[PDB]
Write a protein that holds these residues in place. Sequence first.
Motif, PDB file in Angstrom:
ATOM      1  N   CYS A  62      32.347   2.081 -42.145  1.00 47.75           N
ATOM      2  CA  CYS A  62      32.246   2.363 -43.562  1.00 47.75           C
ATOM      3  C   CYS A  62      32.459   3.845 -43.845  1.00 47.75           C
ATOM      4  O   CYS A  62      32.396   4.682 -42.941  1.00 47.75           O
ATOM      5  CB  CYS A  62      30.909   1.867 -44.099  1.00 47.75           C
ATOM      6  N   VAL A  63      32.709   4.167 -45.115  1.00 45.14           N
ATOM      7  CA  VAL A  63      33.384   5.422 -45.444  1.00 45.14           C
ATOM      8  C   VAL A  63      32.445   6.460 -46.054  1.00 45.14           C
ATOM      9  O   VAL A  63      31.551   6.126 -46.845  1.00 45.14           O
ATOM     10  CB  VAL A  63      34.577   5.169 -46.377  1.00 45.14           C
ATOM     11  N   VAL A 105      31.159   9.790 -48.362  1.00 48.10           N
ATOM     12  CA  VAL A 105      31.258  10.235 -49.744  1.00 48.10           C
ATOM     13  C   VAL A 105      30.596  11.603 -49.841  1.00 48.10           C
ATOM     14  O   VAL A 105      29.521  11.827 -49.267  1.00 48.10           O
ATOM     15  CB  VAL A 105      30.602   9.229 -50.714  1.00 48.10           C
ATOM     16  N   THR A 125      33.308  -7.667 -27.063  1.00 48.45           N
ATOM     17  CA  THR A 125      33.013  -6.272 -26.759  1.00 48.45           C
ATOM     18  C   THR A 125      31.509  -6.034 -26.741  1.00 48.45           C
ATOM     19  O   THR A 125      30.768  -6.585 -27.550  1.00 48.45           O
ATOM     20  CB  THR A 125      33.686  -5.349 -27.779  1.00 48.45           C
ATOM     21  N   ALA A 133      24.578  16.519 -44.503  1.00 47.07           N
ATOM     22  CA  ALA A 133      24.229  15.922 -45.808  1.00 47.07           C
ATOM     23  C   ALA A 133      25.480  15.323 -46.459  1.00 47.07           C
ATOM     24  O   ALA A 133      25.989  15.841 -47.461  1.00 47.07           O
ATOM     25  CB  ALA A 133      23.583  16.957 -46.707  1.00 47.07           C
ATOM     26  N   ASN A 134      25.972  14.234 -45.873  1.00 46.31           N
ATOM     27  CA  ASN A 134      27.167  13.554 -46.349  1.00 46.31           C
ATOM     28  C   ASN A 134      26.812  12.084 -46.545  1.00 46.31           C
ATOM     29  O   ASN A 134      26.363  11.435 -45.606  1.00 46.31           O
ATOM     30  CB  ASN A 134      28.324  13.770 -45.349  1.00 46.31           C
ATOM     31  N   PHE A 135      27.026  11.568 -47.753  1.00 50.27           N
ATOM     32  CA  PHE A 135      26.614  10.210 -48.085  1.00 50.27           C
ATOM     33  C   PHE A 135      27.580   9.189 -47.484  1.00 50.27           C
ATOM     34  O   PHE A 135      28.671   9.525 -47.027  1.00 50.27           O
ATOM     35  CB  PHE A 135      26.539  10.022 -49.600  1.00 50.27           C
ATOM     36  N   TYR A 136      27.176   7.921 -47.489  1.00 45.42           N
ATOM     37  CA  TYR A 136      28.046   6.865 -46.989  1.00 45.42           C
ATOM     38  C   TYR A 136      27.999   5.669 -47.929  1.00 45.42           C
ATOM     39  O   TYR A 136      26.960   5.365 -48.526  1.00 45.42           O
ATOM     40  CB  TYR A 136      27.652   6.422 -45.573  1.00 45.42           C
ATOM     41  N   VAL A 137      29.141   4.990 -48.054  1.00 44.83           N
ATOM     42  CA  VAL A 137      29.228   3.724 -48.766  1.00 44.83           C
ATOM     43  C   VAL A 137      29.864   2.714 -47.821  1.00 44.83           C
ATOM     44  O   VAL A 137      30.819   3.032 -47.098  1.00 44.83           O
ATOM     45  CB  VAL A 137      30.018   3.844 -50.089  1.00 44.83           C
ATOM     46  N   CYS A 138      29.300   1.505 -47.788  1.00 40.79           N
ATOM     47  CA  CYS A 138      29.586   0.571 -46.703  1.00 40.79           C
ATOM     48  C   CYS A 138      29.838  -0.824 -47.264  1.00 40.79           C
ATOM     49  O   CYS A 138      28.927  -1.431 -47.862  1.00 40.79           O
ATOM     50  CB  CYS A 138      28.425   0.551 -45.706  1.00 40.79           C
ATOM     51  N   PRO A 139      31.045  -1.373 -47.108  1.00 38.06           N
ATOM     52  CA  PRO A 139      31.311  -2.746 -47.535  1.00 38.06           C
ATOM     53  C   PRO A 139      30.528  -3.743 -46.702  1.00 38.06           C
ATOM     54  O   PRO A 139      30.118  -3.435 -45.576  1.00 38.06           O
ATOM     55  CB  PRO A 139      32.821  -2.904 -47.300  1.00 38.06           C
ATOM     56  N   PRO A 140      30.276  -4.944 -47.231  1.00 33.96           N
ATOM     57  CA  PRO A 140      29.589  -5.980 -46.454  1.00 33.96           C
ATOM     58  C   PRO A 140      30.386  -6.344 -45.212  1.00 33.96           C
ATOM     59  O   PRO A 140      31.618  -6.456 -45.258  1.00 33.96           O
ATOM     60  CB  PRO A 140      29.509  -7.168 -47.426  1.00 33.96           C
ATOM     61  N   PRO A 141      29.713  -6.525 -44.074  1.00 34.06           N
ATOM     62  CA  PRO A 141      30.429  -6.806 -42.829  1.00 34.06           C
ATOM     63  C   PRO A 141      30.924  -8.246 -42.768  1.00 34.06           C
ATOM     64  O   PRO A 141      30.444  -9.141 -43.470  1.00 34.06           O
ATOM     65  CB  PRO A 141      29.373  -6.546 -41.744  1.00 34.06           C
ATOM     66  N   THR A 142      31.914  -8.453 -41.899  1.00 32.75           N
ATOM     67  CA  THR A 142      32.493  -9.768 -41.665  1.00 32.75           C
ATOM     68  C   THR A 142      32.686  -9.967 -40.170  1.00 32.75           C
ATOM     69  O   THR A 142      32.692  -9.010 -39.388  1.00 32.75           O
ATOM     70  CB  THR A 142      33.837  -9.946 -42.396  1.00 32.75           C
ATOM     71  N   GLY A 143      32.867 -11.231 -39.783  1.00 34.29           N
ATOM     72  CA  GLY A 143      33.036 -11.612 -38.392  1.00 34.29           C
ATOM     73  C   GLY A 143      34.294 -11.086 -37.710  1.00 34.29           C
ATOM     74  O   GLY A 143      34.552 -11.430 -36.554  1.00 34.29           O
ATOM     75  N   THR A 164      34.918  -8.229 -36.483  1.00 37.90           N
ATOM     76  CA  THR A 164      34.558  -7.454 -35.307  1.00 37.90           C
ATOM     77  C   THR A 164      33.191  -7.918 -34.819  1.00 37.90           C
ATOM     78  O   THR A 164      32.216  -7.871 -35.570  1.00 37.90           O
ATOM     79  CB  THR A 164      34.545  -5.949 -35.608  1.00 37.90           C
ATOM     80  N   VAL A 202      30.234  -7.711 -31.646  1.00 36.55           N
ATOM     81  CA  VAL A 202      29.727  -6.849 -30.585  1.00 36.55           C
ATOM     82  C   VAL A 202      28.417  -7.425 -30.054  1.00 36.55           C
ATOM     83  O   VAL A 202      27.687  -8.120 -30.768  1.00 36.55           O
ATOM     84  CB  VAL A 202      29.536  -5.399 -31.084  1.00 36.55           C
TER      85      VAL A 202
END
Lengths: 50, 220, 50, 100, 41
Positions: B88-89, B91, C10, E1-11, E13, E15
Motif C-alpha cells: 500500500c501507498v 501519503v 511464499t 512521519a509519513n502517512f499510508y493509505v492501504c487498499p483492501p487485500p486480496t488473495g 498474493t 504468504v
Amino acid sequence: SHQLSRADITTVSTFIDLNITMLEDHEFVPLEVYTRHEIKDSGLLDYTEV
Amino acid sequence: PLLSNTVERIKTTSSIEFARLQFTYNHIQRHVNDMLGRVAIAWCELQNHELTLWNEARKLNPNAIASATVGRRVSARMLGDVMAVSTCVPVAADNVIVQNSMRISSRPGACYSRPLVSFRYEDQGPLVEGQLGENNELRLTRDAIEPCTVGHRRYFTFGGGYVYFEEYAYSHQLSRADITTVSTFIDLNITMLEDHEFVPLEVYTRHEIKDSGLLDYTEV
Amino acid sequence: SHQLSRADITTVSTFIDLNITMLEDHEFVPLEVYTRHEIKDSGLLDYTEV
Amino acid sequence: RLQFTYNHIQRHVNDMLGRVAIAWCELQNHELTLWNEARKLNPNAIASATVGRRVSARMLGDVMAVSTCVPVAADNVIVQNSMRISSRPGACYSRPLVSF
Amino acid sequence: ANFYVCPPPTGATVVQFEQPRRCPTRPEGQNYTEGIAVVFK
C-alpha cells in the motif's frame, strides 16, 4: 469446595533454559626445561674453577 | 593409564613456551565454544517457541504482523490459514487535515471512535475523505462508530506526534516527547575487549648472563 | 478447488538469525630465536676444545 | 606469540558477542509488536509488568491511562461460599465474590 | 512521519510463516583417559 497449595498442582515450564558456566580460575607455576645453572654445569671444563 | 573402579639420540628444545600456550589456547577455546554453542541452541529454541505467539498475533491484528514480518508496510487479511497481503501507498504529512469534531451531526447518540480525515494523494490531487487508522494509516470507509459516552478524552497517532481530543472535539496536537514512555525493551550491555600490546621483556639478557662468569678465557 | 505443496506458497521469516561460528583449533610449533648450540658457538674461544 | 594468541581470541570474542548484541536488539524490536497487540486484551497485566509496579490501566486510543493500586493484606479478605444469585436463578457469577 | 493509505487485500498474493528449524545438538565431548606420567628431557 476448598483451597490448594501452589505445589499441589503440576507445573509446566514456560521458560527456556540457558546453562552458562563460568571460566575457572587457574594458576601458572614457574616452569623451565633447563635452569641457568644446569646450562653452566653442562660444560666439560670451566676456566674460572680450573 | 588408570581406570576408576566405576638407535638415535633425541634432542630436546630449551624452551617450553609452546606447550603452555597450547594449554591456554585449548582451555579458552573449550570454554568459549561450549558457552557459545549453548547460546546458539537457546536462541534456536527461543525462536521456535515464539513462533507460537506469532501464530496468534497474525489473527489478532494481521496488518501489523504482515508489516513486521514481510519487510515493508503492507495491509493483510487472514484468509483461512494464510494471509492475503497487499503493498500500500504512502501519503505526505502536509496533505492531511483532521476534522475538528467526530460527532455525527445527523445521528445523535453515535460518535466516531476514530478521527475523521481529509487527504490528497498528490500535491495537486482532489480532496478525499476518509478515516484515520493505527500507526499513521488511512482508512477509506468510515465505519468505526460507538455509542456516545460522557468522559471522552482520547489520544491518536498523527505524523510524528499525537492529537488529543476532548469530548468528541479537537483539543490540540502534542509532541512525542510530551508523554512519558515506559521501556518495553530488555537491556543487554556488551563492551569489546581492549587491544593490548606486549613489549619485549626478559629477566636476564644474553650479555648479563655472559657477564655473570668470573673469568672469560677469550678476554684473558 | 485443489491441493498444493507447502513449497508452492511464499514464506516470510518469523525468525531472528544468530550466526555464531566456532573458534578453530591451532598448533603451536617449537619456535626458538637462538638454539643453545648457537649461543654456545657465539663465543670466540672455548677452553674445553682448545 | 602472546600477541598472536591474544589477538586471535580477541577477534573471535569481539565478533561473536557483537553478533549476540545485534540479535538481542532485533529480538526486542521484533517483540514490540506482540506487546502492541497483547496490551489490548488485558491492559492491566502489561501495564503492571512494563511500568514497574502493580498498576491498573485502560487504553485511550494509542495511549493508556495509568493508576497505581492499593495493597490489601491477605488475611483481611473473606470469600463467600456461593456464586449463586439468590434473586435470579439461571444467572451465576464467574469469579469468586469477596469482602475485604 | 509519513502517512499510508492501504487498499483492501486480496488473495492475489499469499504468504505463510516459516516452520520451526531443527536446533543444533551439543558435541559429544572429548573422551579423556586418566593416568600417571613421567616426562623425560
